[PDB]
Ligand SMILES: Nc1ncnc2c1ncn2[C@@H]1O[C@H](COP(=O)(O)O)[C@@H](O)[C@H]1O
């Protein structure tokens with residue numbers, strides 16, 4: 261199945277036919293303070309996307325920059341501290357770690373080498389202490405969106421008389437536009453496939469990257485640009501959300517029930533609905549899982565997408581169809597709830613689909629079911645009294661394999677045997 265996504269460059273869905281090696285760049289955070297949940301809506305978006313490509317069978321190499329420069333103790337200690345915390349918040353929200361993290365301060369050579377090239381193509385100029393890119397040397401500029409020579413000219417390199425680097429234009433630092441563009445060009449070379457960000461990058465930052473890269477390359481760069489819509493509040497960090505007694509994954513759930521091209525109206529009340537819906541999901545799945553016999557239970561340890569019933573495959577394909585049309589994970593979730601409540605599926609089938617959909621949803625369902633069950637009370641009914649005999653016998657016949665298999669059945673339901 262081919263992923264179809266909404267491409268801002270062309271205002272229609274682009275088809276993604278190249279399964280062998282798709283390259284994805286996402287603008288990363290500023291690292292001068294904790295990121296807020298608005299930033300994480302967008303990172304959950306990148307996550308949903310890479311996870312969907314992978315789920316659909318694409319091999320993805322995904323890169324993210326970290327801007328650790330000087331917004332517009334050691335500056336490095338600070339940005340190092342808020343770098344670890346960002347990725348710590350990421351782990352709390354089950355956001356896949358990029359395959360490559362490109363740190364602006366570690367890639368100044370390529371940035372300088374891209375300016376050198378642009379200057380030799382007569383595209384640049386120096387004014388008021390800065391090297392500017394001259395956008396009129398470039399008829400196409402900004403078609404994706406709609407002391408300077410032109411309003412929309414942009415800085416490439418900042419200089420000053422007194423974090424700083426030497427250059428052919430003097431000591432200075434790059435603009436954020438040149439960091440994103442140059443780093444892509446070094447890491448992915450002439451060949452980005454999908455470039456992500458928030459909608460606010462449409463009208464300045466992304467078109468600026470494009471200008472840099474396509475003038476450098478002297479050709480088409482990066483066919484697909486995908487943008488996520490804003491999270492709107494009446495800004496909040498994850499700590500704030502933990503401190504008000506929410507769980508990170510509650511915000512995750514909330515991000516899941518809304519397509520990436522919609523604005524998300526955030527509130528405590530909608531976060532609360534998400535917390536309850538996520539809580540019921542886990543409780544319902546826990547009842548299903550508690551109720552299993554050894555043969556059904558072993559089946560979920562195994563190859564999940566090896567379906568035992570056509571009706572599972574049906575729901576799997578209905579799922580694929582949904583996510584493959586433009587990252588519609590919200591309809592995926594909707595589908596899981598149809599599945600949970602369904603009377604044409606056994607308990608074991610519902611869990612299989614849960615565990616498969618969770619490869620995208622990333623709610624820790626498996627491990628949330630084990631935690632939920634470890635908190636109910638012990639009730640030894642007959643079917644349990646008998647596995648123990650089966651076990652006490654097997655441990656006497658000295659068939660420790662069977663004994664350990666029984667043991668490992670109780671453990672997966674949260675029981676220990678002493
Ligand atoms: N309220 C918001 N909702 C969704 N994404 C946002 C919001 N604010 C910032 N972003 C995105 O978060 C990423 C980094 O944000 P910043 O570090 O503030 O530049 C960018 O991709 C932004 O477009």
Ligand SMILES: [Zn+2]
Nearest residue numbers: 287288440465
């Ligand atoms: Zn960027």
